[PDB]
Amino acid sequence: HIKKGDNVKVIAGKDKGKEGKVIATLPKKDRVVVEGVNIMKKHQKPGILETEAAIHVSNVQLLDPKTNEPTRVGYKFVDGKKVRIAKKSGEEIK
Amino acid sequence: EARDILKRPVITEKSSEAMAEDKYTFDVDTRVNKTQVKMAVEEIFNVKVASVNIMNYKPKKKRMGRYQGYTNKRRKAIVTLKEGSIDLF
Amino acid sequence: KAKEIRDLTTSEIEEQIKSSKEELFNLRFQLATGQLEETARIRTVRKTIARLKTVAREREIEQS
Amino acid sequence: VKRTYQPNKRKHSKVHGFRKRMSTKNGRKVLARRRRKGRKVLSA
Amino acid sequence: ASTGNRRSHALNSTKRRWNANLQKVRILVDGKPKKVWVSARALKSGKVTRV
RNA sequence: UAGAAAUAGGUGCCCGUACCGCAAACCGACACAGGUAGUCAAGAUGAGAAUUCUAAGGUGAGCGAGCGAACUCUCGU
RNA sequence: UGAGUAGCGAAAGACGGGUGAGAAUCCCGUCCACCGAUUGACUAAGGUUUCCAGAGGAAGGCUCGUCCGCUCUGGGUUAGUCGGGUCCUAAGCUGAGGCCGACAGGCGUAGGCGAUGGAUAACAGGUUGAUAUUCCUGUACCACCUAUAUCG
RNA sequence: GAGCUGUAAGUAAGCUUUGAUCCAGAGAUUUCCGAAUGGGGAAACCCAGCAUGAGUUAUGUCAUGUUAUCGAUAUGUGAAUACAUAGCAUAUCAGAAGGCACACCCGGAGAACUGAAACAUCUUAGUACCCGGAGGAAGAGAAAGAAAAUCGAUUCCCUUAGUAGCGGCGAGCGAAACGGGAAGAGCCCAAACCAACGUUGGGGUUGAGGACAGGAGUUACAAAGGACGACAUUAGACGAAUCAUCUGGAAAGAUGAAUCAAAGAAGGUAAUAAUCCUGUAGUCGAAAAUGUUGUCUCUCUUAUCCUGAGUACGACGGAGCACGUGAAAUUCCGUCGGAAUCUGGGAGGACCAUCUCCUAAGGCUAAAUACUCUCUAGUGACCGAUAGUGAACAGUACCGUGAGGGAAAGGUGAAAAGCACCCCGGAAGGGGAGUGAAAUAGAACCUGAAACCGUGUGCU
Ligand SMILES: [K+]
Ligand SMILES: [K+]
Ligand SMILES: [Mg+2]
Ligand SMILES: [Mg+2]
Ligand SMILES: [Mg+2]
Ligand SMILES: [Mg+2]
Ligand SMILES: [Mg+2]
Ligand SMILES: [Mg+2]
Ligand SMILES: [Mg+2]
Ligand SMILES: [Mg+2]
Ligand SMILES: [Mg+2]
Ligand SMILES: [Mg+2]
Ligand SMILES: [Mg+2]
Ligand SMILES: [Mg+2]
Ligand SMILES: [Mg+2]
Ligand SMILES: [Mg+2]
Ligand SMILES: [Mg+2]
Ligand SMILES: [Mg+2]
Ligand SMILES: [Mg+2]
Ligand SMILES: [Mg+2]
Ligand SMILES: [Mg+2]
Ligand SMILES: [Mg+2]
Ligand SMILES: [Mg+2]
Ligand SMILES: [Mg+2]
Ligand SMILES: [Mg+2]
Ligand SMILES: [Mg+2]
Ligand SMILES: [Mg+2]
Ligand SMILES: [Mg+2]
Ligand SMILES: [Mg+2]
Ligand SMILES: [Mg+2]
Ligand SMILES: [Mg+2]
Ligand SMILES: [Mg+2]
Ligand SMILES: [Mg+2]
Ligand SMILES: [Mg+2]
Ligand SMILES: [Mg+2]
Ligand SMILES: [Mg+2]
Ligand SMILES: [Mg+2]
Ligand SMILES: [Mg+2]
Ligand SMILES: [Mg+2]
Ligand SMILES: [Mg+2]
Ligand SMILES: [Mg+2]
Ligand SMILES: [Mg+2]
Ligand SMILES: [Mg+2]
Ligand SMILES: [Mg+2]
Ligand SMILES: [Mg+2]
Ligand SMILES: [Mg+2]
Ligand SMILES: [Mg+2]
Ligand SMILES: [Mg+2]
Ligand SMILES: [Mg+2]
Ligand SMILES: [Mg+2]
């Protein structure tokens, strides 16, 4: 229900309250990589790389198209297709 | 089936030294006789074969951590060419 | 590719099987001499042969 | 001094090998027991 | 043949068998004459006729 | 017995083949003074394959350095 | 704990040079010494990669270790004629039918399997780090096939 | 419905919205050994025949099919031996073989330690083991019964009852009928007698009957099929409702204010979440295959004679019956003998007579019952790494000629962020510097007791 390119709000963790694009999705581990969220400093042998580390998908939430408030997402059918729709408003999600 | 008989060329220092004497070394299927190897070489590389020498290699004991095992058993054929030449590279 | 194979005559399937087995043989020899480096071609040809033999058997079982 | 085990490939195969076990009902019982216990090696 | 017991005077029990009174005669089995072992009681009964 | 050439050219498969092997790799739990079938058989001496020293060839033994008591072991008077 | 105690598994080593962080212990050299009806050479069984090269030194090696039958990586065994099968039988094993036996099975005919024996065509030289009567060179032999003129 | 090329990091090379990886239904492929079956053989190998096809001048080589034994059918051919038969050759069938959870079940065969405070009868025990045969259950079953006022096949549960009885009348062994329940079902032949050419049809099936004079069905009662529908199973889909602050590395905790509920089961998420996620209640869903099923259909039907003979039964020897041969009926086996024929025959615990009940010596039959290697969904005042499986990572390592025996071994962190860089060192290992909430969480990685081993010293 959370896809690459989505605008998400971080609702738990160190960066709670920040918004970012979902760079990557790891469905097997149920984790996503959110740009600017959970920055790790790794010791590169052949400096100090600073790059995002994945966080659990349950720590991010989609933002409603209308109110721009976090919303759970349902599913509806329109001409034989499943479309994400917001709970808070009901408008289809991009 | 000729391309099933021959698996791969063997490129080693000894096999290169044999290549200098028009002898070509192949790993072959473990169930084939040297007549089949000669025919397969003739069909694939359009050369004349003077003789074929063949030998079997037992599985080699090998390990990766606590996992000890064996390599596959091998059959090695050395093919001496009467005429022609084989451009493996 | 099964759709593309299905439009070939039985003899043509046999002709493509032989040439695919020839390309596969050439790839293995290149790999053994450290000259291929394009290793994904091996599995592609292997599965293509499998598809070609699958259809040959399918039609050889519809005819009988 | 001479010890009890003097190995012999042929002797070992003929007395304890698979075909010798298959040759008698009690040998087949041995094979069945070893299959039931889950042995990697059923015979020589 | 059935199994039972041989009993001593002190009633000690020992396993024993009771064998049939088999006699080797030719009885024409399945049309073809053939010498087979047949019980004397069976011969008395009359189901099997010799020769 | 019933019965019914030379020459020339070509073809010739499978399995074993490494290494140790009177042993550091075999049988003895050991890189263990033990056990392990056959073959080859130099010179001097000698009846000899005995003996002692040598040849071919191999080997210096997978803890050492001192000291030169008792006692123990092997050896000489 | 016993205790830095017993032991460190038959023996002759010395020195020079080298390598190295480190050397009685590895490499090379000279001298010395031991076996030599064998401590030499070659077959068989058995083992099954221990073989070769390059790299290593945690553990293994009764000390040490730069070394190794140890570790890592890559290699190495070539046959018409050698030994065995496509030949033969011995003991023994097995055994169509068959005989016998509560069952399971036991025995046995023809036949078969089965060497430790019988038959059977290749030798000399060279060459590798590692294979050689197998590779190369030289010179042969045996069986079969075909082409150009009695078998039983 | 966006990632994917197993575990399982690593690249490299690629696949994928022109729908991949993945899940389920069905297909195709499926080396070699193994009953192993062309022959052999020390399993996973060796060596062949025949036919067909590649290839070669040709041989060598290869590919494909076929070739075990015993059965079955049908074509010949042929002995001793005249006819015949035995036998032999060929084609056709593909019936058997072997395995198992073989736990439960039926049968064959069948101990001993032990108890009797010794021991032989007895007991352990018809148990263990072995062997044979099967099924999803098996066995039993339609009264020659139980009984004594009548019941009405079998099986299984309760009870009768530790009673009656058996028993070196010791140790011990130990019913059944009645009554209460689960389940419930009855049938087919042989015979007399007819029709035909002894063999087939018709007929008949019992406690007195028989001879003669639409309704039932593939669960027994005869046996093969189709049409349509239903349901269920094997993938899935939707699925209500929370925000803020505080402490924190992180909130689900605390505090304040809300919401949902046919959903407050559960698990996950950086600490303890009905409202964040996966789910839950509830609802929806099948191209294909598999079942169970209903209707239609489709099938079949409308006392003159006989009544199971080497039988019942008896003697001797045994066995099974709770019962040890006893007052021992009732059931079975070996040997030997050996009936009656509705005025018949059998039982009612020796036996006789009456009375009463039944009708042997042919067969078939669902359910109630037994078990769990399994599968699906769940449960526990069950274990929590010396426990719980032997086994959380193994019938492995290791031991043994072999049968066989048989371990040890779980935990970094929320996230690899798994310590760039500098210094001593050949390395190992350290001290810094960084990451982290924590590095005495640094991989021999949670906590880290005791024994044991050290360094310093207040008193001695
Ligand atoms: K060799
Ligand atoms: K969460
Ligand atoms: Mg060879
Ligand atoms: Mg050699
Ligand atoms: Mg050695
Ligand atoms: Mg030594
Ligand atoms: Mg020794
Ligand atoms: Mg010795
Ligand atoms: Mg002499
Ligand atoms: Mg001497
Ligand atoms: Mg001590
Ligand atoms: Mg001291
Ligand atoms: Mg002392
Ligand atoms: Mg002392
Ligand atoms: Mg000492
Ligand atoms: Mg020593
Ligand atoms: Mg000497
Ligand atoms: Mg070496
Ligand atoms: Mg050491
Ligand atoms: Mg090595
Ligand atoms: Mg026999
Ligand atoms: Mg018999
Ligand atoms: Mg021999
Ligand atoms: Mg050598
Ligand atoms: Mg097989
Ligand atoms: Mg076979
Ligand atoms: Mg066989
Ligand atoms: Mg058949
Ligand atoms: Mg068959
Ligand atoms: Mg079974
Ligand atoms: Mg069974
Ligand atoms: Mg007693
Ligand atoms: Mg059985
Ligand atoms: Mg059975
Ligand atoms: Mg959902
Ligand atoms: Mg929800
Ligand atoms: Mg909160
Ligand atoms: Mg009757
Ligand atoms: Mg009795
Ligand atoms: Mg009785
Ligand atoms: Mg009685
Ligand atoms: Mg009676
Ligand atoms: Mg613990
Ligand atoms: Mg355990
Ligand atoms: Mg550190
Ligand atoms: Mg450090
Ligand atoms: Mg540091
Ligand atoms: Mg650190
Ligand atoms: Mg701590
Ligand atoms: Mg700890």
Task: Tell me the CATH number at D22.
Answer: 1.10.287.3980
Could you give the CA distance from residue C25 to residue B5 in angstroms, rounded to a whole number?
A: 11
Could you give the CA distance from residue B77 to residue B59 in angstroms, rounded to a whole number?
A: 17
Kindly give the interhelix angle for C40-62 and C10-32, rounded to the nearest 10 degrees. Answer: 160
* Structural domains counted in chain C: 1
Total residues found in chain A within this entry: 94
Give SS3 for B87. coil
DSSP for residue B59:
P
Nearest residue of chain C to residue B11 (CA atoms): C33
CA distance B65 to chain C (A): 27
Could you give the CA distance from residue B48 to residue B82 in angstroms, rounded to a whole number?
A: 5
Q: Which residues, 6+ apart, have CB-to-CB distance to A35 below 8 Å?
A: A20, A21, A22, A23, A52
Experimental method for this entry? cryo-EM
Q: Which domain holds residue D11?
A: 1-44
Say how far D36 CA is from H376 C1', in Å: 26
* Structural domains counted in chain A: 1
Q: Which residues pair with A56 in a beta bridge?
A: A31
Domains and CATH numbers, chain B: 1-89 (3.30.70.330)
Burial of B86 (0-12, 13-18, 19+ CB in 10 A): middle
Q: Which residues are found with C-beta within 5 Å of the ion, ligand 2? A: A 58
Say how far B65 CA is from H440 C1', in Å: 31
CA distance C45 to chain B (A): 14
Give SS3 for D27. helix
Q: Which domain holds residue C14?
A: 1-60
Could you tell me if A70 and A9 are in contact, meaning their C-beta atoms sit under 8 angstroms apart? Answer: yes
Distances D4 to D1, D7, D13, D44 between C-alpha atoms, Å: 10, 10, 18, 19
Nearest CA to B54 out of B73, B82, B81, B26 is that of B26
Residues of C in contact with B8 (CB under 8 A): 28-29, 31-32
